[model samples]
Target: ATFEIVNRCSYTVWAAASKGDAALDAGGRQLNSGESWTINVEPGTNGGKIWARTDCYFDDSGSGICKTGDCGGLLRCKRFGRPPTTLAEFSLNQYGKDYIDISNIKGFNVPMDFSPTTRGCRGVRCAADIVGQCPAKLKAPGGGCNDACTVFQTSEYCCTTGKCGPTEYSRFFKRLCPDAFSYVLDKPTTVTCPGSSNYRVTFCPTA
Candidate 1:
């Protein structure tokens, strides 16, 4: 299995992936503008995700932190990204399906598109201008919005203890990016592609 990660943003993006032992690429090099990285997505893999870090400064030894989506202060991440990030998550060959979604439930730093390269699978994207327009309370200091769950931390926002639905806050995200994951209870945006298809993830795609 394979995935092509394309960077289409105007700014440089420090790509990060959390799947297994291997993490980070280009020795934490930046994907400037149109550059991209092709990564192997292992067969029968689940609980894998890809994200990007902005405003990062690292030493020669790959030790540093990012303003957003920093993982343990290391360029190579052994775990998932922190909040205020745009996430492309996937789990392949899960019951004959390839589950994928672009999640803003953690908040958005960049717009993205996630789709299958193979025929028959539809594309899902979150390409809205979310950074400057983030709601006041949900906004993060560096940039981007914090998830309702991250900010409020209540059942209403986290939906941890009981059945909960979208609130005014989640609705704000939903309205901005209708095809992306906006909250814990958000559904219908996730796509189940056929297991045999390859996937494409693009950052800041044009229309």
Candidate 2:
């Protein structure tokens, strides 16, 4: 699968991706407003993710910190980014089908749209003004909003017990972006497509 990642935010953004040990697009790239990058995913890549980092200042050697979505200070991220971050997730070629979603389970930074280029497939998006509307307890430092679990670290919000359901915090996120995976057990958010489909992940998407 090929992913075309676009940045439409007014500010600079660093795009990052991870599929286990495999690095997509060298794991990351700095994208100015209107800039974009493309990445190809090998078949059977499961639980891979794409996200954006903001307010970063990376030196020539590709090491720096970001206000949101920092990945251990590496431009070429080898691990999942720190939250609060919006995510585009995928599992490709799973029995001839592709699974995809836009996830806010880690909380949100920028708005995003995750969609398939191929016809007959659906898309998912989370472009709500989450940071501005964030509840005080779930607000992150500098920018972005935090998930309830991130702030409280309780099974009630984290679903660590595997029997928990949405709380008021997850409901807050769900109210804004119903298509997003707001909590761990939110299963209806996932979308299915043909294995051959290509996708686009747009940050600060207009629509």
Candidate 3:
């Protein structure tokens, strides 16, 4: 029911964790490089996600936009983060286990490592420099790559018609991080662990 978030990078990161549309920790927090925070998640929480926003500028009142991982232009998110951002997604206590994944299906903005402190749970990560080598077609305005769905907006790219698979574009991401999801239909990356365990999420984890 908790997460230890560490920012190992050399820049500030605005961390956010939420269930539904509400913030999970007193409305989120800003972490300087090398700083860490522990977030206590509510029990029975399903479909919760944690992410980092970079290159942000906020007023004293905490309203700002981020270069990557902006959630509706709000410093404190009230919903899922918009795409073109890397994601750490999980669902707790569903079907007798907790499911987790480090997803690049929305396209990656940051490198991350996710691991459970509890014995018997496995770890997963995508700690590659995806932003630096992002494909031109999927590039974002501020930096990072946009998802194929976001870039093309076609059913083929979105996988909405239920018959699409990875294109050359999706393969670009898959090749960089085979351990992470690269498209909407990418499911093999999902992992399960005991729901009662605590976890650690680190940004910019070294290899």
Identify the leading candidate in terms of lDDT: 2
> Per-prediction TM-score, please?
0.93, 0.96, 0.95
Better of 1 and 2 by lDDT: 2
The stretch of ten residues in a row with the least summed lDDT in candidate 1 is: 20-29
Per candidate, the number of residue pairs that clash is 0, 0, 0
Candidate 2: give the clashing pairs.
none
Instruction: Give per-residue CA lDDT, model 1, range 57-79, as digits (tens).
Output: 88888889888888778787777
lDDT (Cα atoms) of all candidates against the true structure: 0.82, 0.90, 0.83
Residues 100-194 of candidate 2 have per-residue lDDT tens digits of 99888999999999999888788998998988999999899868999999999998889988998988999989998999988999867789899
lDDT of 3 by residue, 15-130 (tens): 87876568776545788989999988876678888888888888888887888887777777767676677888888888678888888878888889988978777989989888
Model 3 steric clash pairs: none
Q: How far is each candidate from the true structure, as Cα RMSD in Å?
A: 2.0, 1.2, 1.4
Per TM-score, the best of the predicted structures is: 2
Could you tell me the lDDT of residue 146 within candidate 2?
91
